[PDB]
Paper text:
In particular, substitutions of Val122 and Lys123 by two consecutive prolines was found to lead to a stable chaperone where motions are dampened as proline has the lowest rotational freedom of all amino acids. The mutated model was computationally predicted to adopt a new conformation, where the MBP moiety is turned by ~170 degrees according to the trans-configuration between Pro122 and Pro123. The mutated Mb, termed Pro-Macrobody (PMb), showed strongly reduced flexibility in MD simulations and retained the positive properties of Mbs such as their simple design and their elongated structure. We then transformed Sbs against NgLptDE into PMbs and crystallized PMb21. The X-ray structure of PMb21 at a resolution of 2 Å confirmed the predicted structure and showed the lowest B-factors around its linker region that forms a short poly-Pro helix-II stretch. The C-terminal end of the Sb moiety and the N-terminal region of MBP feature rigid β-sheets that are only bridged by the intrinsically stiff di-proline linker without additional interactions that would stabilize interdomain motions. The specific binding moiety could thus be exchanged without a change in the properties of the connection. Further, the PMbs retained their binding kinetics compared with the original Sbs using grating-coupled interferometry (GCI), a biophysical characterization method similar to surface-plasmon resonance. PMbs are different from the recently described megabodies, as they feature only a single rigid linker. Since any Nb or VHH can be converted to a PMb by fusing it in an identical rigid manner to the MBP moiety, they could become a widely applicable tool to improve the results in cryo-EM, especially for small and challenging targets.
Author numbering:
A (entry chain A), B (entry chain A): 1 to 483
Write the structure that this text describes.
Amino acid sequence: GPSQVQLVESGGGLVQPGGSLRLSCAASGFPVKYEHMYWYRQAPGKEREWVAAINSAGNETHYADSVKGRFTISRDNAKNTVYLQMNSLKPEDTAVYYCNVKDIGWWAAYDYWGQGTQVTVPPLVIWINGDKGYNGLAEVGKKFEKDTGIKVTVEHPDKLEEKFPQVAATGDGPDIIFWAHDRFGGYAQSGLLAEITPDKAFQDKLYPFTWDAVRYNGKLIAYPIAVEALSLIYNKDLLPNPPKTWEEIPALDKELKAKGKSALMFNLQEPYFTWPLIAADGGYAFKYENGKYDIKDVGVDNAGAKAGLTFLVDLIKNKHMNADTDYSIAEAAFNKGETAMTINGPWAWSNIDTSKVNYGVTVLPTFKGQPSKPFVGVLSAGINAASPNKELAKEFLENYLLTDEGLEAVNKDKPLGAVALKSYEEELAKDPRIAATMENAQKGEIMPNIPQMSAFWYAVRTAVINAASGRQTVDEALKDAQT
Amino acid sequence: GPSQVQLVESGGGLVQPGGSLRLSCAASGFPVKYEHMYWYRQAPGKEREWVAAINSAGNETHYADSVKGRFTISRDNAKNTVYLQMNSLKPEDTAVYYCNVKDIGWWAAYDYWGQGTQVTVPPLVIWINGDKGYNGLAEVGKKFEKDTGIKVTVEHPDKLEEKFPQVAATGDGPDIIFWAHDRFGGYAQSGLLAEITPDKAFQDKLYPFTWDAVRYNGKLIAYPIAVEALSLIYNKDLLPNPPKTWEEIPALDKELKAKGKSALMFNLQEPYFTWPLIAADGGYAFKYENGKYDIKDVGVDNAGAKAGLTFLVDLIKNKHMNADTDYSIAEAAFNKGETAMTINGPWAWSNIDTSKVNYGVTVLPTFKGQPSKPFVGVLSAGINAASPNKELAKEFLENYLLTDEGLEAVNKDKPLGAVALKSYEEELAKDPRIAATMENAQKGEIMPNIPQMSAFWYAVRTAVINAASGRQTVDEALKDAQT
Ligand SMILES: OC[C@H]1O[C@H](O[C@H]2[C@H](O)[C@@H](O)[C@@H](O)O[C@@H]2CO)[C@H](O)[C@@H](O)[C@@H]1O
Ligand SMILES: OC[C@H]1O[C@H](O[C@H]2[C@H](O)[C@@H](O)[C@@H](O)O[C@@H]2CO)[C@H](O)[C@@H](O)[C@@H]1O
Ligand SMILES: [Mg+2]
Ligand SMILES: [Mg+2]
């Protein structure tokens, strides 16, 4: 008869780090009984590598060093099948796995290969916002991989705070998600977060109020990382002495535009940046009392909020600001020295350093004699409830990220603010920019983490963007936002 | 002694649709020998559901209807362990799986549960650009799920054509990636794409040149979906008769700005939109001859390219266009009736329909008497080489998407252009907007798919954005792009 030598691998698939998979290879068309059988693998961009071998009976068995102690080759001669039991799998093991036999066929001179079966071991996946130190965090991930053999990927999706609930809710998503604490209550209500289990010794390493920020329904639902608040950033050359009041800003802008510059530019598309002026004279989100936020008591349509917004809109009407300015426009204008001031958090300092602008960081201006009240975020890391990697995620967050070395590597990328880890926060307290962050933070308020926060931010955003644009008056906009 | 009843699940993890996983439950602290043992599961946002049960010896066995025929419960009384062999798994099976025993403990009156082990079966994942019909494609996915039981998710990441090579190269990524054919050559060079295996009967269903667009190194590396080319879109009310030449556009814009409008706005941030004017008088990417693209022969610094770019820059200098206009600015301006014309492809028609603008779609204007030459894209779908779901992806693309019903559902979301499927393209040929798409397409050129395309687009983008901005002259910009 003809040569119908055939090898058919099966059993490949998807598996998490630390998991197990059993491959099989069905052999036909030749006296398999008498042949040594081999497993190989090939990944894209790597050369093919031998993995294991087994003799005819099954009693002699050999392994590559890269899989020794983790894989076991076996065979069943009743079925002419050879098996590769793979344990303690790692991202590095991703590959097409092939079966192979040697020196058979006509004249005993030919080797045969199966078509291959795919094995895919995804990395530990982290999502963090694009304005944070994701390259420094990937360096933390490289150390984790060095120690554990498990690859870590950091991604920064656009709109990640809305994408996580939709894909975690399709049973998928990253293993670890970073965001300010305000969104996490909604994720926990939906059951998309694992409860985290730091012991008491580990809890003592971080400031208690940050733990409070990531407490929901009496449960710790994420690891607090760092405390963020907006600050007034200014060009010490353009403006040696920055103004103390929002009321000074128009005349400063006139003096500056006479010289081809402007006073102030910051992001007007996200209400996080316009909130400190809205809250300053009385605006608030949800009134907190008797240990609960009262969700029927929303302070977005009172006279203080309207006074702050009307002031902002007036700045726009007088062409001191432009309704279309967003994060990138304001950053580019400040770091090129075109505007004397901007409003931002610690993550922005990095880029200013590269800009060579001699800048200072200081207290937000007052409005009607009241401090601006920025909403204070606690950058936090939750473990996806659907993650098949929760123990690895815990090890990463506790023993790699939340260390002096881990936070330093992130902070050297984009500054974190007042880090929750006491030991490193003492080291960083000496920074005048962090001192001004903490001053603005204490004049503000911690964001709530209740599930209504999302809707709240959606309303204020609308109301700001409409009022700045003219589509609605300030009273109309805030009334629509109260609903 | 005390009650130390304990149930410990293990064995959960990540597994692809169609795959298998074996759970185990170690029982201690009670005479397991004599107890019925049960498996349950709970997903977030769903109530807990019973799954299976087994009697004391192991000979009597029962299953929920939702898992009947796919799961097998077993037990080993030497180890006081009960097992759940799960086969033909599906996204719907994602859950925390629990072991349970009933009516034991003191007074035989208590039930005990293990802590649970997570099982995660990800959907089939599709990536497609945000300007395409991803909601219509998700409807195709809903039909697929109805028929197969396998959930489909469509995501539209920002910058997906750059993200796919980085994460497919970390051994991860979506199962199916949509993009114009020009990027796929680079993906295939890197070995990130599966070879696809449509039979001849299926190949005959699509126009041969689209197959040619997704051929690399003699291999079919993706499924062609639809043929895209830019067209001139105009407001029939503002401009009953649109201009035939780029040279007419300044005087039209003066007539229009006297009335508070403008002639033309389109995306100036992506060279795809400025290319047809640059190529028109002679600009080209790579010269093709003797069956190969000559990568040492780049036509980006010749006099035709410079004449097209200088014309564009002149439009900007005379304040007929603004260097900062991108996709969203131009779309909003056209669909609000603020500008008489824009330049775009079939995906944009949907939004104009909602805008109630009475628009027409027609031939791009001529430059120095030559047709504008748009680069013609073939929207294509590749299968990730690392996907553990390649057979499902094939079934989806061939038997769901590439049908009259599948393309119709996508096309009703955002029009596809001239679809590669002959049967549906005959139905759609009657459309005057598709006729003008095909006219502009035949006056243009098919994009190459060689791996250098990426670098090519990176250079032209730079050169356009610099020249429009003033940072560089046109000659300087094109010279930098030739390198
Ligand atoms: O603008 C509403 C928005 O504000 C906050 O987001 C901040 C974030 O906390 C900072 O870390 C920084 O990344 O900028 C964001 C604003 O662009 C809330 O945390 C977020 O939930 C809310 O949507
Ligand atoms: O701008 C360079 C860019 O152009 C093409 O991308 C098009 C795409 O083909 C269309 O389908 C539509 O989505 O718009 C894109 C331009 O924004 C190339 O296909 C792409 O490789 C290239 O980077
Ligand atoms: Mg996923
Ligand atoms: Mg993934």
